[PDB]
Design a protein around this ligand. Sequence first.
Ligand SMILES: Nc1nc2c(ncn2[C@@H]2O[C@H](COP(=O)(O)OP(=O)(O)OP(=O)(O)O)[C@@H](O)[C@H]2O)c(=O)[nH]1
Lengths: 162, 42, 96, 144, 46, 14, 161, 212
Amino acid sequence: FLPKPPQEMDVIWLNERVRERVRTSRQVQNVYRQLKYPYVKTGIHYSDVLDHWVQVPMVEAAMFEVEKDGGFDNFILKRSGPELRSTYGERIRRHILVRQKEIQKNFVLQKQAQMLVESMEKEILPMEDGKKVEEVLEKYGIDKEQLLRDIARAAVAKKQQL
Amino acid sequence: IDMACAMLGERLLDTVNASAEWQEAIAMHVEEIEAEMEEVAA
Amino acid sequence: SFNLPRERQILGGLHADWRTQMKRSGSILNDITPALPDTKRTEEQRRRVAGWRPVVKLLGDQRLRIAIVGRMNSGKSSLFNLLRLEPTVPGRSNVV
Amino acid sequence: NRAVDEKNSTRDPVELPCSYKGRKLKLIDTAGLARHRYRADRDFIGRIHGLSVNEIRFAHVVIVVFDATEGHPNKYDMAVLHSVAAEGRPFLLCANKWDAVLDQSATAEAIDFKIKRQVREVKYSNAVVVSAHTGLNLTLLMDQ
Amino acid sequence: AAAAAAAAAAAAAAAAAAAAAAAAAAAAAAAAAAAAAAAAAAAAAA
Amino acid sequence: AAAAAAAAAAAAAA
Amino acid sequence: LEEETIRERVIYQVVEGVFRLSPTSADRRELRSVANIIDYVLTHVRAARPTDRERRQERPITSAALAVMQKCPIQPQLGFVHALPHDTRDALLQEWERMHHLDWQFGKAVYTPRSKENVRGNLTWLREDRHYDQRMKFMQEVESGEARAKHMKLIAEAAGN
Amino acid sequence: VAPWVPPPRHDIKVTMPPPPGGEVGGRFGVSQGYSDRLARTPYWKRMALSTYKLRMMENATRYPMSEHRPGEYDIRYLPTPYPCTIRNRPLLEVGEPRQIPSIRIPVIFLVNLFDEAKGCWFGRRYETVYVERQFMREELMPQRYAIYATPEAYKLLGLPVVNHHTHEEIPKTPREYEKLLERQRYDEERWKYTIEYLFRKYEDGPPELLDR
Ligand SMILES: Nc1nc2c(ncn2[C@@H]2O[C@H](COP(=O)(O)OP(=O)(O)OP(=O)(O)O)[C@@H](O)[C@H]2O)c(=O)[nH]1
């Protein structure tokens, strides 16, 4: 059995369950039984998607399975609702899914920015005059002040690194 | 838009270094950034 | 194609040999501990042992000294307890 | 002999003749005494305990070692002391690991309190602190 | 030393206010606000 | 290239 | 706890001359502390700062940029923020938890939107990047017309079978 | 009260009933699946909708294994409708003492990490190294200097895919861990177990016979 029903067990017990072991006395007349529980280790893992350390009560089997799956996020995603009987597990699963969608959105944003910069670079590859540069800048909806500030920041970073 | 601005700025810097008033403004911004970095380090 | 995964037959991780199960059980069954190997004596320990002094003088038995050597379970202890005869301390039998 | 951290390092008695201050003697080392609780489960160590008791029964003086790191003699230590007293051998008590014990004064007070609380002639037993590694009061122990 | 204490407190308050403004770059917008709409500054939050 | 000791970084925030 | 006498004059000489504010009766009553006054000034300047709506109104998106973004083969899927759990608890308890390490101890985690993210070791980023690469390969195949030929061959062999 | 009762979890079949609920969902205790839609549908209608080829396809059942849970016996044939526990047994037996050595796991390094204290290299970029579990989960992973070695990870990184059976069968003794290490070494350097390599030291002849 488990200490709590499947819908209430907050801890992550993959397959470990409470089991009673039986031992006979020195004389075989009588027997004594005792319950045994798994070794619960607080898994303080790091999830790449969240980028921040997350700790949750777990078991040695849970830690080994996380290592097998190659990541806490992968382990949680592989484990399904009924299979992962943890409310904490469900909360972290929702956080991980939201963060994964955010990762995808950020990648799409980066790709859109790359396409825009490539298009404008094709447009203004030659250098003709600041007037035409500003005309293209307003055509593409960009501020010269922030363009200059980011150019200066990039130059500072380049100088610092070399 | 902002990320496109940053990427365009770095690409323009790369092209320029591979090759007036805007240059002066860039120099002033560089000086300001250097001063801010020095203050943060201090 | 049509095959079943390899899996142990005896359940519970038990062993088909009660001797293996006994050695797994351990102390309560196998009371006798295994052979004791030579201890790891450090250089500092050797130096301290050399520096020690005898608070009492050990006497070299004037009678002929004969030592029995050999491998384990060679009957050396049985031969020793057959030859030995203690008139003053009865019950001095070496464990065999 | 050989000393190792293992509980039952030696399983047979050992006798070494020697003279201290011009007085012959045979220093005897025993395997060790265990409580009946442990012996019943492990009769073999019970066998070596019986072998040790046999030599205690024939010794002319008995010296009971108890580790000072424990801080005071155990109930089984007092049981062994009473056993040797009943056998009728001059019994002495020695606290070992004195170079390792931390609170020397507290350990000495505890030992003295135990000796005083002892009821029979064991109450008159004299306790001496002796250290093996350092080698402290060995001559005093032999003199006693 | 009431006057000295008052002067020191005023100087410390001015320095702290300047540091706080510089932390959030408030002075940048504050200069324009003072130049144009010093009467009152408020941004519709909705 | 990067360098790191055996205890420089701790998962939790010390 | 600044005394009222010195306070009045300090506020009149600094806030009016520097920030040109106007606290109310209760505001001045609560402004006894230097920390309180500086926090009030910070809050008021923060409110006065331009709003995101105002900034967008003054700097709207341009038709060319919108067209390029729409033509981009990839578009985002928003609404992921609607999925993270919404805990209904005590405000003070939540403040305590966030200040301490309890914010991550038991199935909890804070959410902060990010524009740029670290890619090194990001399995999600790597898998989406490979997905995009294979999508680009598929687009190249479609442009070259190989996909049309393959589909025609598949249909022809299916009909023949 | 349930205004809407969810249908059977996996009822794609047109004639055969859905598998037992425990096989696909998360609730066991029954060996025979049921679907009210299929039961109520007249036999003639089901046969009309289906075709002999489709009927045989949907009738084909994997025995004794399960179709949905690969590598596990289906619950409808076990003595009880609950899943077999032999494969998913708990990590430690009731009487087994915990004696598990400090197992090492394979980690792909994403950046050349230089151990300055030891004056060496932990591992080069995109290289696999067997490291300590605690070390990997405590320092390498949070620093993003390396990741666990998985076939999916290799596929993502573009490196050749190798299926390191990490924790496939968790060892329970130092001897079992040694057996696991030996199996890993064999699977890695299979070429070292050839007859030629085994007799390499006797390539030409006995050293004593060989002249100096
Ligand atoms: N530090 C310290 N340790 C001591 C001293 N005397 C004995 N010991 C301990 O005794 C241990 C060695 O065991 P032995 O000397 O063989 O004593 P034993 O365990 O009773 O062995 P047997 O009597 O042969 O059964 C060492 O590990 C020490 O910890 C001492 O004077 N100082």
